[PDB]
């Protein structure tokens, strides 16, 4: 199956004193592997997966250097954006950045991305072709002009199609015991009665990896979405994920309803009944 490496960065300004709170996290697929937190004591990029601990002090020195530079860019940005938007020094503001690369089953480059938001709104993003920019408003258009003049897209494209893919492969290989393992969902059904005429069936998927999954209900072999509730996929806290989907049914008619589960760890999609 497909894989990705993504980095996520948040800076939140602190108006009254000092620099922003900066938090950086790195992922391979749905596995966090590194973090930097400006409030933490170490002031180093820190490992969050055993397979990254393989990398030497030179790696850690390099990543720490770069991540501090990312923090300084964000600090400057928060000031620039306050100016662009004619805002006061009184309020706290947020910048968010995400970039990374997708590869397919053959581990070859599929897609790259680099996007930026200010106070939770799109600001500027690299287009799919990795050659041009989407600027949401006139402030971001001024940024676009600057980045065109400085050939920023060209630098990013080289990274996204090159280093990003190359190091994704490296991590996938080094972390193969977990990163290349799929954990099929463990499934079961629960039943509840709300009245003597209405029941709830809930189809559970637990302990699965990666997070991508599909859970659906059928009634007499036909798709059922009415009277269903599907919760957001949630982290278990041990690296795996959980989800459920429920349906409301007439008491006594539970037999018509079947839950269907699709996941990369199941060679055959799975069916459950009450």
């Amino acid at each position: 199956g497909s894989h990705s490496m993504r980095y996520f960065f948040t800076s939140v300004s602190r108006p009254g004193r000092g620099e922003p709170r900066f938090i950086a996290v790195g992922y391979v697929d749905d596995t966090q592997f590194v973090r930097f937190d400006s409030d933490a004591a170490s002031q180093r990029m820190e490992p969050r997966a055993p397979w990254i601990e393989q990398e030497g002090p030179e790696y850690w020195d390099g990543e720490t250097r770069k991540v501090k530079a990312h923090s300084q860019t964000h600090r400057v940005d928060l000031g620039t954006l306050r100016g662009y938007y004619n805002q006061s020094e009184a309020g706290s503001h947020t910048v968010q950045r995400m970039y990374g690369c997708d590869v397919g089953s053959d581990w070859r480059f599929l897609r790259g991305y680099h996007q930026y938001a200010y106070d939770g709104k799109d600001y500027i993003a690299l287009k799919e072709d990795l050659r041009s920019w989407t600027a949401a408003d006139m402030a971001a258009q001024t940024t676009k002009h600057k980045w065109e003049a400085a050939h920023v897209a060209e630098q990013l494209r080289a990274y996204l199609e090159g280093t990003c893919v190359e190091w994704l492969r490296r991590y996938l290989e080094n972390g193969k015991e977990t990163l290349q393992r799929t954990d099929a969902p463990k499934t079961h059904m629960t039943h509840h009665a709300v009245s003597d005429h209405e029941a709830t069936l809930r189809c559970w998927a637990l302990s699965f990896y990666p997070a991508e999954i599909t859970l659906t209900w059928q009634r007499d072999g036909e798709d059922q979405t009415q009277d269903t509730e599907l919760v957001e996929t949630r982290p278990a806290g041990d690296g795996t994920f959980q989800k459920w989907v429920a349906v409301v049914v007439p008491s006594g008619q539970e037999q018509r309803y079947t839950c269907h589960v699709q996941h990369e760890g199941l060679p055959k999609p799975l069916t459950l009944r009450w």
Binding site: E63, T73, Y84, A140, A150, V152
Partner: peptide, 9 residues
């Protein structure tokens, strides 16, 4: 591996 350089807005 983080991107080498990060341009300011």
């Amino acid at each position: 591996n983080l991107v080498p350089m990060v341009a300011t807005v």
